[PDB]
Tab-separated table of C-alpha atoms in Angstrom:
chain	number	residue	atom	x	y	z
A	502	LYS	CA	96.521	134.062	144.219
A	503	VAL	CA	94.030	131.204	144.298
A	504	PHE	CA	90.464	132.231	143.480
A	505	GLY	CA	87.397	130.391	144.575
A	506	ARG	CA	84.740	129.125	142.202
A	507	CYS	CA	82.493	132.094	143.003
A	508	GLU	CA	85.235	134.642	143.540
A	509	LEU	CA	86.520	133.879	140.045
A	510	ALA	CA	83.019	133.837	138.525
A	511	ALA	CA	82.536	137.388	139.736
A	512	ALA	CA	85.873	138.620	138.363
A	513	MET	CA	85.260	136.947	135.003
A	514	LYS	CA	81.703	138.283	134.903
A	515	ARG	CA	83.044	141.766	135.687
A	516	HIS	CA	85.615	141.423	132.908
A	517	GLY	CA	82.713	140.647	130.590
A	518	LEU	CA	83.195	136.923	129.875
A	519	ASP	CA	79.588	135.985	130.572
A	520	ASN	CA	78.208	135.020	127.171
A	521	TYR	CA	81.249	136.265	125.289
A	522	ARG	CA	80.797	134.934	121.769
A	523	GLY	CA	78.002	132.767	123.121
A	524	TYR	CA	79.892	131.216	125.992
A	525	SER	CA	77.966	131.093	129.263
A	526	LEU	CA	80.014	132.342	132.246
A	527	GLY	CA	80.145	128.811	133.636
A	528	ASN	CA	82.309	127.835	130.681
A	529	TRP	CA	85.184	130.128	131.638
A	530	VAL	CA	85.128	129.244	135.344
A	531	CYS	CA	85.062	125.550	134.550
A	532	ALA	CA	87.892	126.147	132.060
A	533	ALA	CA	89.992	127.774	134.730
A	534	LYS	CA	89.368	124.995	137.294
A	535	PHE	CA	90.740	122.390	134.919
A	536	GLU	CA	93.595	124.533	133.646
A	537	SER	CA	94.989	126.349	136.694
A	538	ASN	CA	92.534	124.990	139.250
A	539	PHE	CA	92.001	128.675	140.025
A	540	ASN	CA	95.657	129.368	140.846
A	541	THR	CA	96.720	132.585	139.103
A	542	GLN	CA	100.388	131.675	139.451
A	543	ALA	CA	100.044	128.233	137.936
A	544	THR	CA	102.774	127.575	135.402
A	545	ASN	CA	103.669	124.384	133.568
A	546	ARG	CA	106.797	123.916	131.498
A	547	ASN	CA	106.068	121.744	128.490
A	548	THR	CA	108.592	119.499	126.727
A	549	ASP	CA	108.480	121.449	123.471
A	550	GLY	CA	110.111	124.106	125.610
A	551	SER	CA	107.071	126.318	126.073
A	552	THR	CA	105.236	127.118	129.301
A	553	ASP	CA	101.561	127.564	130.198
A	554	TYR	CA	100.904	130.655	132.328
A	555	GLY	CA	98.305	131.501	134.927
A	556	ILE	CA	94.624	130.974	135.523
A	557	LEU	CA	93.913	129.865	131.953
A	558	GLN	CA	97.339	128.327	131.330
A	559	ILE	CA	98.012	130.241	128.113
A	560	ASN	CA	100.973	128.851	126.175
A	561	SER	CA	104.219	130.782	125.652
A	562	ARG	CA	104.971	129.492	122.157
A	563	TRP	CA	101.908	131.264	120.833
A	564	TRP	CA	100.224	133.981	122.868
A	565	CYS	CA	102.822	135.502	125.175
A	566	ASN	CA	106.549	136.194	125.357
A	567	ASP	CA	108.631	134.569	128.087
A	568	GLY	CA	112.016	134.686	126.402
A	569	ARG	CA	112.544	130.939	126.846
A	570	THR	CA	110.749	129.825	123.706
A	571	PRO	CA	112.932	130.525	120.594
A	572	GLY	CA	110.328	130.297	117.844
A	573	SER	CA	107.621	131.658	120.140
A	574	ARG	CA	104.927	133.995	118.890
A	575	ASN	CA	103.199	136.614	121.020
A	576	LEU	CA	99.745	136.700	119.503
A	577	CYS	CA	98.262	138.458	122.538
A	578	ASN	CA	101.237	140.807	122.330
A	579	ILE	CA	102.189	140.661	126.024
A	580	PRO	CA	104.866	139.306	128.379
A	581	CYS	CA	103.985	135.858	129.710
A	582	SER	CA	104.520	137.212	133.212
A	583	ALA	CA	101.394	139.320	132.611
A	584	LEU	CA	99.307	136.169	132.832
A	585	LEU	CA	100.614	135.635	136.372
A	586	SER	CA	99.054	138.736	137.928
A	587	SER	CA	96.711	138.372	140.920
A	588	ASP	CA	94.358	140.460	138.792
A	589	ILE	CA	92.892	138.500	135.875
A	590	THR	CA	92.597	141.236	133.198
A	591	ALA	CA	95.729	139.952	131.479
A	592	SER	CA	94.543	136.385	130.896
A	593	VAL	CA	90.920	137.490	130.423
A	594	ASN	CA	91.763	139.698	127.458
A	595	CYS	CA	94.239	137.362	125.907
A	596	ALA	CA	91.600	134.678	126.386
A	597	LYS	CA	89.042	136.742	124.478
A	598	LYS	CA	91.454	137.027	121.577
A	599	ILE	CA	92.284	133.305	121.573
A	600	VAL	CA	88.561	132.465	121.566
A	601	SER	CA	87.336	135.218	119.280
A	602	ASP	CA	90.411	134.769	117.120
A	603	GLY	CA	88.342	132.044	115.488
A	604	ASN	CA	89.637	129.266	117.743
A	605	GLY	CA	86.720	129.035	120.167
A	606	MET	CA	86.992	127.537	123.604
A	607	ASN	CA	88.031	124.253	121.960
A	608	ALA	CA	91.341	126.091	122.298
A	609	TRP	CA	91.495	124.564	125.796
A	610	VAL	CA	91.271	120.792	125.448
A	611	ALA	CA	90.317	120.737	129.124
A	612	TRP	CA	87.259	122.780	128.224
A	613	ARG	CA	86.524	120.206	125.577
A	614	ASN	CA	87.190	117.275	127.914
A	615	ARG	CA	85.767	118.593	131.183
A	616	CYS	CA	83.416	121.435	130.318
A	617	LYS	CA	81.954	120.943	126.823
A	618	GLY	CA	78.574	119.266	127.029
A	619	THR	CA	78.185	119.462	130.803
A	620	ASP	CA	75.685	121.546	132.741
A	621	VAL	CA	78.370	124.211	133.384
A	622	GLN	CA	75.941	126.649	134.909
A	623	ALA	CA	77.018	124.597	137.927
A	624	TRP	CA	80.295	126.417	138.336
A	625	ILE	CA	78.461	129.561	139.336
A	626	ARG	CA	75.543	127.955	141.082
A	627	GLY	CA	75.390	129.412	144.562
A	628	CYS	CA	77.384	132.569	143.817
A	629	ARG	CA	76.258	136.130	144.512
A	630	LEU	CA	77.323	137.617	141.188
B	245	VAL	CA	92.773	125.555	104.856
B	246	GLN	CA	93.631	123.171	101.987
B	247	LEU	CA	96.194	120.341	102.116
B	248	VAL	CA	98.199	119.012	99.176
B	249	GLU	CA	99.706	115.519	99.110
B	250	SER	CA	102.722	114.056	97.278
B	251	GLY	CA	104.752	110.869	97.150
B	252	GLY	CA	103.360	107.397	97.671
B	253	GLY	CA	102.882	104.517	95.295
B	254	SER	CA	104.156	100.954	95.361
B	255	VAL	CA	107.253	99.955	97.308
B	256	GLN	CA	108.627	96.473	97.908
B	257	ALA	CA	108.816	94.644	101.224
B	258	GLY	CA	111.361	96.146	103.578
B	259	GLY	CA	111.524	99.205	101.367
B	260	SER	CA	111.267	102.883	102.259
B	261	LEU	CA	108.976	105.476	100.683
B	262	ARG	CA	108.422	109.223	101.263
B	263	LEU	CA	105.064	110.903	101.555
B	264	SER	CA	104.827	114.678	101.764
B	265	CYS	CA	102.075	117.106	102.657
B	266	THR	CA	101.845	120.878	102.416
B	267	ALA	CA	99.066	122.748	104.184
B	268	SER	CA	98.348	125.698	101.918
B	269	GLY	CA	96.223	127.077	104.740
B	270	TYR	CA	98.560	130.083	104.914
B	271	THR	CA	97.246	132.052	107.912
B	272	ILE	CA	98.482	131.096	111.359
B	273	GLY	CA	99.246	127.415	111.682
B	274	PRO	CA	98.225	124.693	111.277
B	275	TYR	CA	98.953	123.560	114.834
B	276	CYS	CA	99.168	119.860	113.997
B	277	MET	CA	99.842	117.752	110.926
B	278	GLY	CA	99.830	113.991	110.759
B	279	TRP	CA	98.824	110.973	108.703
B	280	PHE	CA	96.042	108.404	108.917
B	281	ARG	CA	95.732	105.313	106.745
B	282	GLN	CA	93.045	102.843	105.780
B	283	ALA	CA	93.014	99.375	104.206
B	284	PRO	CA	89.892	97.973	102.476
B	285	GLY	CA	88.946	95.945	105.500
B	286	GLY	CA	89.686	98.460	108.186
B	287	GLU	CA	88.555	101.568	109.972
B	288	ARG	CA	90.721	104.658	109.535
B	289	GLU	CA	93.831	104.147	111.647
B	290	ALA	CA	96.286	106.748	112.976
B	291	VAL	CA	99.833	106.790	111.688
B	292	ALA	CA	101.765	109.803	112.936
B	293	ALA	CA	101.387	113.413	113.999
B	294	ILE	CA	103.951	116.139	114.368
B	295	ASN	CA	103.562	119.350	116.292
B	296	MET	CA	104.191	122.324	113.997
B	297	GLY	CA	105.951	124.642	116.394
B	298	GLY	CA	107.877	122.629	118.945
B	299	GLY	CA	108.180	119.749	116.493
B	300	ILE	CA	107.120	117.025	118.949
B	301	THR	CA	106.280	113.732	117.261
B	302	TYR	CA	103.792	110.986	118.040
B	303	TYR	CA	103.556	107.599	116.334
B	304	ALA	CA	101.144	104.674	116.342
B	305	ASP	CA	102.699	101.576	117.909
B	306	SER	CA	102.026	100.085	114.499
B	307	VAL	CA	104.505	102.347	112.754
B	308	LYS	CA	106.509	103.740	115.661
B	309	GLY	CA	110.158	102.867	115.189
B	310	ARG	CA	109.991	102.609	111.410
B	311	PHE	CA	108.111	105.646	110.184
B	312	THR	CA	109.411	109.156	110.797
B	313	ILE	CA	107.399	112.356	110.467
B	314	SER	CA	109.022	115.787	110.389
B	315	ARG	CA	108.716	119.260	108.924
B	316	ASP	CA	110.278	119.808	105.483
B	317	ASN	CA	111.652	123.264	104.614
B	318	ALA	CA	108.675	124.527	102.574
B	319	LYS	CA	106.053	126.354	104.675
B	320	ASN	CA	103.510	124.034	106.331
B	321	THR	CA	105.053	121.009	104.735
B	322	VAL	CA	105.557	117.859	106.787
B	323	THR	CA	107.127	114.630	105.583
B	324	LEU	CA	106.359	111.019	106.415
B	325	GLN	CA	109.322	108.758	105.718
B	326	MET	CA	108.013	105.193	105.748
B	327	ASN	CA	110.823	102.662	106.424
B	328	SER	CA	111.033	98.866	106.898
B	329	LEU	CA	107.745	98.666	104.949
B	330	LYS	CA	105.421	95.698	105.331
B	331	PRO	CA	102.353	94.785	103.200
B	332	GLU	CA	100.254	95.395	106.308
B	333	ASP	CA	101.265	98.987	105.562
B	334	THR	CA	99.542	98.857	102.189
B	335	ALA	CA	96.665	101.341	102.330
B	336	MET	CA	95.322	104.800	101.569
B	337	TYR	CA	97.215	107.498	103.473
B	338	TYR	CA	95.497	110.742	104.403
B	339	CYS	CA	97.179	113.949	105.501
B	340	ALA	CA	95.363	115.910	108.171
B	341	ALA	CA	95.812	119.237	109.857
B	342	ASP	CA	94.336	120.776	112.993
B	343	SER	CA	93.731	124.476	112.286
B	344	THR	CA	93.061	125.251	115.945
B	345	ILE	CA	95.673	127.368	117.697
B	346	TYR	CA	95.360	125.875	121.197
B	347	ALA	CA	95.540	128.250	124.181
B	348	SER	CA	97.293	125.963	126.640
B	349	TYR	CA	99.752	123.278	125.520
B	350	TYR	CA	98.306	120.576	123.307
B	351	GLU	CA	99.835	117.334	122.106
B	352	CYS	CA	98.896	116.262	118.589
B	353	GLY	CA	99.339	112.664	119.643
B	354	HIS	CA	96.081	112.967	121.540
B	355	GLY	CA	93.883	113.896	118.602
B	356	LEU	CA	95.617	111.424	116.289
B	357	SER	CA	95.150	108.548	118.758
B	358	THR	CA	91.534	109.244	119.605
B	359	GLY	CA	90.185	108.831	116.081
B	360	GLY	CA	91.386	112.268	115.049
B	361	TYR	CA	89.447	114.669	117.252
B	362	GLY	CA	90.801	118.079	116.289
B	363	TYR	CA	91.956	117.414	112.737
B	364	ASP	CA	89.590	119.610	110.780
B	365	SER	CA	91.340	119.543	107.393
B	366	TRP	CA	91.946	116.423	105.307
B	367	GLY	CA	93.803	115.484	102.147
B	368	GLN	CA	92.487	113.308	99.306
B	369	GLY	CA	94.813	110.469	100.163
B	370	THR	CA	97.644	108.642	98.459
B	371	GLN	CA	97.799	104.916	97.838
B	372	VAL	CA	100.786	103.012	99.228
B	373	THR	CA	101.112	99.418	98.132
B	374	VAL	CA	103.864	97.374	99.702
B	375	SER	CA	104.180	94.493	97.260
B	376	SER	CA	105.002	91.422	99.359
Protein backbone atom coordinates (compact mmCIF):
# COMPACT_ATOMS: atom_id res chain seq x y z
CA LYS A 1 0.00 0.00 0.00
CA VAL A 2 1.02 3.64 -0.24
CA PHE A 3 -0.50 5.86 2.45
CA GLY A 4 -1.03 9.55 2.14
CA ARG A 5 0.33 12.09 4.59
CA CYS A 6 -3.06 12.37 6.30
CA GLU A 7 -4.15 8.79 5.81
CA LEU A 8 -1.00 7.66 7.60
CA ALA A 9 -1.32 10.32 10.32
CA ALA A 10 -4.72 8.90 11.19
CA ALA A 11 -3.50 5.29 11.32
CA MET A 12 -0.50 6.25 13.45
CA LYS A 13 -2.68 8.39 15.71
CA ARG A 14 -5.09 5.46 16.06
CA HIS A 15 -2.20 3.15 16.92
CA GLY A 16 -1.30 5.62 19.66
CA LEU A 17 1.91 7.20 18.33
CA ASP A 18 0.80 10.77 18.97
CA ASN A 19 3.06 11.95 21.79
CA TYR A 20 4.47 8.50 22.46
CA ARG A 21 7.40 9.10 24.79
CA GLY A 22 7.04 12.79 24.01
CA TYR A 23 7.06 12.53 20.25
CA SER A 24 4.42 14.65 18.51
CA LEU A 25 2.47 12.71 15.85
CA GLY A 26 4.12 14.78 13.13
CA ASN A 27 7.42 13.13 14.02
CA TRP A 28 6.30 9.64 13.03
CA VAL A 29 4.61 10.71 9.79
CA CYS A 30 7.65 12.72 8.77
CA ALA A 31 9.81 9.72 9.71
CA ALA A 32 7.81 7.48 7.44
CA LYS A 33 7.94 9.91 4.48
CA PHE A 34 11.72 9.91 4.54
CA GLU A 35 12.06 6.19 5.22
CA SER A 36 9.44 4.48 3.05
CA ASN A 37 7.91 7.61 1.56
CA PHE A 38 4.67 6.10 2.84
CA ASN A 39 5.03 2.84 0.89
CA THR A 40 4.25 -0.07 3.22
CA GLN A 41 6.02 -2.51 0.91
CA ALA A 42 9.23 -0.52 0.69
CA THR A 43 12.25 -2.75 1.14
CA ASN A 44 15.93 -1.96 0.74
CA ARG A 45 18.69 -4.55 0.74
CA ASN A 46 21.78 -3.17 2.42
CA THR A 47 25.36 -4.23 1.66
CA ASP A 48 25.96 -5.70 5.11
CA GLY A 49 23.40 -8.21 3.92
CA SER A 50 20.45 -6.90 5.90
CA THR A 51 17.23 -5.38 4.57
CA ASP A 52 15.01 -2.50 5.71
CA TYR A 53 11.30 -3.39 5.74
CA GLY A 54 8.16 -1.36 5.26
CA ILE A 55 6.80 2.02 6.20
CA LEU A 56 9.51 2.71 8.79
CA GLN A 57 12.23 0.68 7.06
CA ILE A 58 13.12 -1.40 10.11
CA ASN A 59 16.37 -3.32 9.67
CA SER A 60 16.54 -7.13 9.50
CA ARG A 61 19.87 -7.52 11.29
CA TRP A 62 18.32 -6.21 14.48
CA TRP A 63 14.55 -6.06 14.87
CA CYS A 64 13.03 -8.70 12.61
CA ASN A 65 13.81 -12.10 11.12
CA ASP A 66 14.04 -12.50 7.35
CA GLY A 67 16.24 -15.57 7.20
CA ARG A 68 18.77 -13.84 4.94
CA THR A 69 20.82 -12.20 7.67
CA PRO A 70 23.05 -14.83 9.43
CA GLY A 71 23.94 -12.97 12.62
CA SER A 72 20.58 -11.19 12.65
CA ARG A 73 18.73 -10.48 15.87
CA ASN A 74 14.95 -10.23 16.16
CA LEU A 75 14.55 -7.68 18.91
CA CYS A 76 10.91 -7.01 18.01
CA ASN A 77 10.50 -10.78 17.90
CA ILE A 78 8.68 -10.95 14.54
CA PRO A 79 9.17 -12.03 10.92
CA CYS A 80 10.43 -9.19 8.73
CA SER A 81 7.53 -9.88 6.39
CA ALA A 82 5.27 -8.59 9.19
CA LEU A 83 6.56 -5.10 8.53
CA LEU A 84 5.24 -5.35 4.97
CA SER A 85 1.55 -5.59 5.85
CA SER A 86 -0.90 -3.04 4.41
CA ASP A 87 -1.92 -2.60 8.04
CA ILE A 88 0.70 -0.73 10.07
CA THR A 89 0.33 -2.40 13.51
CA ALA A 90 3.44 -4.49 12.87
CA SER A 91 5.85 -1.61 12.25
CA VAL A 92 4.03 0.66 14.72
CA ASN A 93 4.62 -1.69 17.64
CA CYS A 94 8.12 -2.63 16.69
CA ALA A 95 8.72 1.10 16.29
CA LYS A 96 7.51 1.75 19.83
CA LYS A 97 9.99 -0.79 21.14
CA ILE A 98 12.89 0.61 19.10
CA VAL A 99 12.11 4.12 20.38
CA SER A 100 11.14 3.25 23.94
CA ASP A 101 13.92 0.68 24.04
CA GLY A 102 16.06 3.66 25.00
CA ASN A 103 17.08 4.48 21.43
CA GLY A 104 14.68 7.34 20.75
CA MET A 105 13.71 8.45 17.29
CA ASN A 106 17.39 9.20 16.63
CA ALA A 107 17.12 5.52 15.72
CA TRP A 108 16.09 6.76 12.26
CA VAL A 109 18.85 9.00 10.93
CA ALA A 110 16.28 10.34 8.48
CA TRP A 111 14.28 11.56 11.46
CA ARG A 112 17.43 13.22 12.68
CA ASN A 113 18.28 14.65 9.26
CA ARG A 114 14.83 15.55 7.95
CA CYS A 115 12.51 15.75 10.94
CA LYS A 116 14.47 16.72 14.08
CA GLY A 117 14.26 20.44 14.67
CA THR A 118 11.66 21.20 12.01
CA ASP A 119 8.09 22.35 12.55
CA VAL A 120 6.83 18.76 12.05
CA GLN A 121 3.30 19.60 13.04
CA ALA A 122 3.27 20.31 9.31
CA TRP A 123 2.96 16.67 8.35
CA ILE A 124 -0.52 16.55 9.80
CA ARG A 125 -1.56 20.09 9.02
CA GLY A 126 -4.77 19.90 7.05
CA CYS A 127 -5.77 16.40 8.15
CA ARG A 128 -9.10 15.42 9.71
CA LEU A 129 -7.70 13.24 12.48
CA VAL B 1 28.75 2.14 28.37
CA GLN B 2 32.50 2.36 29.14
CA LEU B 3 35.33 1.87 26.63
CA VAL B 4 38.81 0.55 27.42
CA GLU B 5 41.84 1.26 25.23
CA SER B 6 45.10 -0.64 24.66
CA GLY B 7 48.15 -0.54 22.42
CA GLY B 8 49.73 2.62 21.08
CA GLY B 9 53.02 4.28 21.84
CA SER B 10 55.94 5.24 19.63
CA VAL B 11 56.58 3.55 16.29
CA GLN B 12 59.14 4.47 13.65
CA ALA B 13 58.45 5.82 10.18
CA GLY B 14 56.89 3.24 7.90
CA GLY B 15 56.18 1.07 10.91
CA SER B 16 52.97 -0.65 11.98
CA LEU B 17 51.29 -0.45 15.39
CA ARG B 18 48.12 -2.02 16.86
CA LEU B 19 45.53 -0.17 18.88
CA SER B 20 42.68 -2.06 20.52
CA CYS B 21 39.43 -1.05 22.14
CA THR B 22 36.86 -3.00 24.12
CA ALA B 23 33.44 -1.53 24.83
CA SER B 24 32.52 -2.92 28.23
CA GLY B 25 29.04 -1.55 27.60
CA TYR B 26 27.70 -5.11 27.78
CA THR B 27 24.00 -4.71 26.92
CA ILE B 28 23.00 -4.69 23.27
CA GLY B 29 25.65 -3.20 21.03
CA PRO B 30 27.42 -0.90 20.58
CA TYR B 31 26.29 -0.35 16.99
CA CYS B 32 29.46 1.42 15.88
CA MET B 33 33.07 1.61 17.02
CA GLY B 34 35.79 3.70 15.46
CA TRP B 35 38.78 5.91 16.15
CA PHE B 36 39.41 9.65 16.07
CA ARG B 37 42.79 11.32 16.50
CA GLN B 38 44.11 14.76 17.34
CA ALA B 39 47.49 16.49 17.02
CA PRO B 40 48.38 19.58 19.12
CA GLY B 41 47.58 21.92 16.28
CA GLY B 42 44.45 20.30 15.00
CA GLU B 43 40.77 19.74 15.51
CA ARG B 44 39.68 16.18 16.28
CA GLU B 45 39.89 14.23 13.03
CA ALA B 46 38.16 10.97 12.07
CA VAL B 47 40.23 7.86 11.51
CA ALA B 48 38.08 4.78 11.04
CA ALA B 49 34.77 3.22 12.00
CA ILE B 50 33.59 -0.34 11.80
CA ASN B 51 30.03 -1.55 11.92
CA MET B 52 29.60 -4.05 14.75
CA GLY B 53 27.16 -6.44 13.15
CA GLY B 54 27.70 -6.52 9.41
CA GLY B 55 31.33 -5.51 9.89
CA ILE B 56 31.32 -2.77 7.23
CA THR B 57 34.35 -0.48 7.44
CA TYR B 58 34.86 3.20 6.71
CA TYR B 59 38.19 5.04 6.62
CA ALA B 60 39.33 8.65 6.37
CA ASP B 61 41.10 9.34 3.07
CA SER B 62 43.99 10.23 5.35
CA VAL B 63 44.40 6.69 6.61
CA LYS B 64 42.38 4.69 4.09
CA GLY B 65 44.62 2.13 2.44
CA ARG B 66 47.07 1.87 5.33
CA PHE B 67 45.01 1.53 8.48
CA THR B 68 42.67 -1.41 9.00
CA ILE B 69 39.90 -1.61 11.59
CA SER B 70 38.15 -4.86 12.47
CA ARG B 71 36.52 -6.77 15.30
CA ASP B 72 38.83 -8.84 17.52
CA ASN B 73 37.46 -12.03 19.13
CA ALA B 74 36.74 -10.60 22.60
CA LYS B 75 33.21 -9.18 22.96
CA ASN B 76 32.87 -5.56 21.76
CA THR B 77 36.53 -5.36 20.96
CA VAL B 78 37.65 -3.71 17.73
CA THR B 79 41.22 -3.36 16.52
CA LEU B 80 42.94 -0.59 14.59
CA GLN B 81 46.04 -1.85 12.80
CA MET B 82 48.02 1.22 11.76
CA ASN B 83 50.40 0.44 8.85
CA SER B 84 52.83 2.46 6.69
CA LEU B 85 52.96 4.98 9.57
CA LYS B 86 53.93 8.59 8.98
CA PRO B 87 54.75 11.30 11.58
CA GLU B 88 51.64 13.12 10.38
CA ASP B 89 49.97 10.17 12.12
CA THR B 90 51.50 11.17 15.44
CA ALA B 91 48.62 12.14 17.73
CA MET B 92 46.18 11.19 20.47
CA TYR B 93 43.83 8.42 19.36
CA TYR B 94 40.36 8.14 20.86
CA CYS B 95 38.07 5.13 20.70
CA ALA B 96 34.39 5.90 20.32
CA ALA B 97 31.20 3.91 20.30
CA ASP B 98 27.66 4.71 19.22
CA SER B 99 25.29 3.03 21.70
CA THR B 100 22.25 3.67 19.50
CA ILE B 101 20.66 0.61 17.93
CA TYR B 102 19.44 2.20 14.69
CA ALA B 103 16.01 1.16 13.36
CA SER B 104 16.74 1.36 9.65
CA TYR B 105 20.21 0.70 8.22
CA TYR B 106 22.92 3.07 9.37
CA GLU B 107 26.48 3.46 8.16
CA CYS B 108 29.04 4.32 10.83
CA GLY B 109 31.07 6.13 8.20
CA HIS B 110 28.49 8.89 8.31
CA GLY B 111 28.83 9.74 11.98
CA LEU B 112 32.62 9.37 11.90
CA SER B 113 32.93 11.72 8.90
CA THR B 114 30.59 14.40 10.16
CA GLY B 115 32.55 15.23 13.31
CA GLY B 116 31.23 12.17 15.12
CA TYR B 117 27.49 12.73 15.35
CA GLY B 118 26.20 9.58 17.02
CA TYR B 119 29.28 8.50 18.97
CA ASP B 120 28.08 8.92 22.52
CA SER B 121 30.85 7.04 24.34
CA TRP B 122 34.53 7.99 24.29
CA GLY B 123 37.82 6.54 25.49
CA GLN B 124 40.60 8.42 27.30
CA GLY B 125 42.91 8.23 24.33
CA THR B 126 46.27 6.70 23.57
CA GLN B 127 49.31 8.57 22.31
CA VAL B 128 50.88 7.40 19.05
CA THR B 129 54.18 8.98 18.14
CA VAL B 130 55.65 8.11 14.79
CA SER B 131 59.28 9.11 15.25
CA SER B 132 60.43 10.46 11.88
